[PDB]
Amino acid sequence: CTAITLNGNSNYFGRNLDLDFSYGEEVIITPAEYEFKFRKEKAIKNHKSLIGVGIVANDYPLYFDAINEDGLGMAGLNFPGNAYYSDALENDKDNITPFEFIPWILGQCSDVNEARNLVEKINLINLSFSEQLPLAGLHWLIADREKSIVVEVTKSGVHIYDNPIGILTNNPEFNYQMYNLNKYRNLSISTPQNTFSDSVDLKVDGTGFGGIGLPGDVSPESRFVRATFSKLNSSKGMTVEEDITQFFHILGTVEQIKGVNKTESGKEEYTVYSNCYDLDNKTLYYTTYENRQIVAVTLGNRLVTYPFERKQIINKL
Amino acid sequence: CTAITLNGNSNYFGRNLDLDFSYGEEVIITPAEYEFKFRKEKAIKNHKSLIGVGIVANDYPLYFDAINEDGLGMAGLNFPGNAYYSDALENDKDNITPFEFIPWILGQCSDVNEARNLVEKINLINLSFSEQLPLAGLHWLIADREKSIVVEVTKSGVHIYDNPIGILTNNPEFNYQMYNLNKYRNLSISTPQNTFSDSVDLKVDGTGFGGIGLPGDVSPESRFVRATFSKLNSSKGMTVEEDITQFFHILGTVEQIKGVNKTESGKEEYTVYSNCYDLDNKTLYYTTYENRQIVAVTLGNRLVTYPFERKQIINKL
C-alpha cells in the first residue's frame, strides 16, 4: 500500500491498495443519518457524511479509505506483526475495533487536531468483523487540507506522528521509514558533477543520472523512498485537472504489477486500485488495475454504492 | 525512451516516448499508394501501408514508431553521441536518411529477416529533414510477432543484434545493456532465504524483499533493467484485453513523471505518450501524459491523421 498527500491548486489525499486478491471494492457514500453501530460503544445516529472505497457487509461500510464532508481523510494500510489490538477492554478508553476506526474518526472529527485528540482516547480492540473477514494488522494516515498524521498502535502504545512529507507505506514503523530517507540525500533530479574524482574523465551518455541509487523494487521501504522522491519533486500544475493527473503519475511510480511480487501464498501482489480525493471539493477520483480511465464521484440513512468497473474502457476511433 | 515486445494471446510491440518537450504528435496512417520520396533514392509509389505515431511536416510522415500491414514494427529511440550518420554517399549502399528509415524498412519488409537483409544494404546519411527539424542520434528496435532486432549505426559500422528479451532504451550500446543485466541475477519475485548468514536472525516484515537491488531511477540503464525484470516476470493474461492492460502496466514501471529528470535544457523529461500495437490485428492503442484513457485505432495516396487529445477524459458519475 502507498498513501500520499499533495498540495497544489486544491489539496489531495489518496492511495494505492496493494493486495494479492480483490474484495470486489466499490464506492460507498455513508450519509449523515446512517446509524453507526459499535461493538463496544453507543451508536452514532447523526454524524458527518463520508465518501470512500471499501466493501459493504451486513449493511456496514468497511472502508479501506474515505473522506468526510469536511475534507478530513483516513486510510488503513497493511502493518503486519507490528499492529497490536487489545484482547481486553480498557475502562479509561474508548474501545473501538479496527474496522470501526474510520467511522469513529471521520464521523466525528473535522480536522487533524480533532482526529489526534480522539485517537489519544482510543483502545483498539481485537474483535473481527465476522469469521470470513478476520482482522489484519493496519496503521493509518489521517490527512486534512493542511497536514497529516500517522497512527501506529503497537505493543508499546498508541503512537501518533506528525507526517512532514505526506507519505506512508507499510513496515517498518514510521520513525524507521523517515530515518531511512537520510541515506538518499545525494540523489538529484539533474545530472550531477563528477565528484568521484577529477582524475578520471567520467562521461554522461543519457539523462536521469542524478537518480541513480533510488530503489526500484516493491518492498514497502523502497516504495516509501521512491514515492517520497517522486512526490516531493513532482512539477506543479496550473489547474486542478493537472494536479489530479500528476497525482496518478506519482502513485504510478510505486504501482505493483502482477508478476513481480509473489507472496508466500503463491499469489501475486498488485495495485488493485489507485485513488485521489480532492479534499476541498470532496470528490473521489479512482482507477483500477483493469481500467485505466479515471472515474469521479462527488459527495439520508441508507448507504449508497457504486461498484468498480474491472474492464478496460477504451476510446475506439 | 523504452520500447518492448510482449507475447501473449496476441503479439505486441510498443513504447514510451520520453522527451522534455512536445508540440503534439498524432496518429498517422500512410496508405499503400502514398508516394514515399527519398533524398537519394527513387520514389516508392506502391508499398505496404503503415499506422504509427509521429508528426507530419511538408506532407511527410515523420514517425517515432509505426507498424505495417504485415505486423512488422519499428521504433526510433534516442541514442545521442553513439549514432553515426555518414557525411558521404556510399555507392555500394542504399543512401537513406534517418527520418526515411522507418518508411524504407516498413514500406518494403514483411518480417524481421527481410528487415535485417535490407539494413545490411544501408548507409544512413547525415541529411536533416529541414533546417527547422534537425537530426537526432537514434537507434531502432524492429519487431514482428516472432522476434526482434536492434539496429545501432555507430562509427564502427551498421550493427544488428538479435534481441533475446524484447527490450530497448537509450545509451549505452546494446551489448553493454545486455551485459549489465548479469549483475542482477539474484533478484527474485519471491522472499528470499537468509543466505547472508545463519548466525543472525534476519526478519522479513513485508512482501517484495526479492526485488531489493532493482534500480528505480529513470536513467536509461536503470530503465532497461527495470523494464526487463517487469516484462519477463509479468503474469500472463487470459484475453487480448488483459494483455494490453498488462502492457501498459509494464511501460508504467519505467514511466518518467514530470519533475524527477531535469535535462541539460532546464526542462523536465517525461513520458509524452505510451503505446501498444497489437501486431496480429494491426491496432494501435495509446495513452498520453495528460490522458490516462486508452485510445485505439486500427489500420489511397494521402496521409490520414488523428491528433492526440491532451485532456484527461474522466468518467463522471
What are the domain boundaries of chain A?
2-308
**Cell numbers placing B188:** 527474485
Give the residue numbers of A annotated as catalytic, written as ranges.
1
Contact residues for A157 (Cβ-Cβ < 8 A; gap 6+):
none
Site from A189, A205, A222, A239 to mutate, B interface, most B CB atoms within 10 angstroms: A205
The CA-to-CA distance between both ends of chain A, in Å, stands at 36
Residues in A closer than 8 angstroms to B290, CB to CB, are 245
Percent helix, percent strand, percent coil in chain A, to nearest 5: 20, 35, 45
Question: To one decimal place, what's the resolution in Å?
Answer: 1.9
DSSP classification of residue B209:
G
Is A91 within 8 Å of chain B by CB? no
Could you tell me where the beta strands, DSSP code E, fall in B101-246? 122-124, 138-143, 148-154, 157-162, 167-168
Mark yes or no for CB contact A217/B216 under 8 Å: yes
d(CA A195, CA B217): 19
d(CA B172, CA B264): 18
Instruction: Please check whether residue B108 is in contact with residue B74, taking contact to mean a CB–CB distance below 8 angstroms.
Output: no
Comparing C-alpha atoms, which of B214, B234, B257, B113 is closest to residue B165?
A: B234
- Distance, in angstroms, between A286 CA and closest chain B CA? 10
Is A239 within 8 Å of chain B by CB? no
Residues in A closer than 8 angstroms to B296, CB to CB, are 314-317
The burial of B161, by beta-carbon neighbours within 10 Å (0-12 exposed, 13-18 middle, 19 or more buried), is given as middle
Mark yes or no for CB contact A314/B297 under 8 Å: no
Give the torsion sign (CA, A55, A61, A65, A66).
Answer: positive
Residue type, B254: V
State the DSSP H helix or E strand holding residue A118, giving kind and residue range, or none if neither: helix A112-119
- Distance, in angstroms, between B184 CA and closest chain A CA? 12
Q: What are the two backbone dihedrals, phi and then psi, of residue A228, each rounded to the nearest 5 degrees?
A: -65, -50
Mark yes or no for CB contact A208/B191 under 8 Å: no
Q: Report the CATH number of the A2-308 domain.
A: 3.60.60.10
Secondary structure class of A144 (helix, strand, coil): coil
Is B313 within 8 Å of chain A by CB? yes
Instruction: Please check whether residue B225 is in contact with residue B214, taking contact to mean a CB–CB distance below 8 angstroms.
Output: yes
Is B302 within 8 Å of chain A by CB? no
How many Cβ atoms are within 10 Å of A91's Cβ, its own excluded? 7
Residues in B closer than 8 angstroms to A176, CB to CB, are none
Nearest to A208 among B27, B81, B220 (CB): B220
The CA-to-CA distance between both ends of chain B, in Å, stands at 36
d(CA A211, CA B211): 18
How many Cβ atoms are within 10 Å of A156's Cβ, its own excluded? 10
Instruction: Please check whether residue A251 is in contact with residue A14, taking contact to mean a CB–CB distance below 8 angstroms.
Output: yes
Helices vs strands, H then E, count in chain A: 5, 17
| CA A66 to each of CA A48, A71, A103, A127, A144: distance values in angstroms, whole numbers, following the listed order | 12, 10, 9, 22, 12
Residue of B nearest to A217 (CA): B211
The approach used to solve this structure was X-ray
The burial of A43, by beta-carbon neighbours within 10 Å (0-12 exposed, 13-18 middle, 19 or more buried), is given as exposed
d(CA A182, CA B36): 57
Nearest to B206 among A213, A219, A295 (CB): A219
Residue of B nearest to A291 (CA): B245
Instruction: Please check whether residue B223 is in contact with residue B169, taking contact to mean a CB–CB distance below 8 angstroms.
Output: yes
Q: How far is CA A114 from the centre of its chain?
A: 20
How many Cβ atoms are within 10 Å of B15's Cβ, its own excluded? 26
Contact residues for B88 (Cβ-Cβ < 8 A; gap 6+):
none
Residue type, A158: V
Beta pairing partners, A133:
A130
d(CA A41, CA A168): 29
Mark yes or no for CB contact A315/B313 under 8 Å: yes
Instruction: Please check whether residue A165 is in contact with residue A228, taking contact to mean a CB–CB distance below 8 angstroms.
Output: yes
Instruction: Please check whether residue A120 is in contact with residue A160, taking contact to mean a CB–CB distance below 8 angstroms.
Output: yes
d(CA A231, CA A254): 11
Is A210 within 8 Å of chain B by CB? yes
Q: Grid cell 507490528 — which residue?
A: A82
Percent helix, percent strand, percent coil in chain B, to nearest 5: 20, 30, 50
Q: How far is CA B177 from the centre of its chain?
A: 15
State the DSSP H helix or E strand holding residue A242, giving kind and residue range, or none if neither: helix A240-252
Is B293 within 8 Å of chain A by CB? yes
Mark yes or no for CB contact A216/B215 under 8 Å: yes
**Cell numbers placing B128:** 536533416
How many Cβ atoms are within 10 Å of B224's Cβ, its own excluded? 26
Is A315 within 8 Å of chain B by CB? yes
d(CA A25, CA A67): 16
**Cell numbers placing B147:** 522476434
Q: Grid cell 535544457 — which residue?
A: B265
Helical spans, DSSP H, in chain B: 101-106, 112-119, 174-180, 220-233, 240-252
Residues in B closer than 8 angstroms to A287, CB to CB, are 292
d(CA B298, CA B300): 16
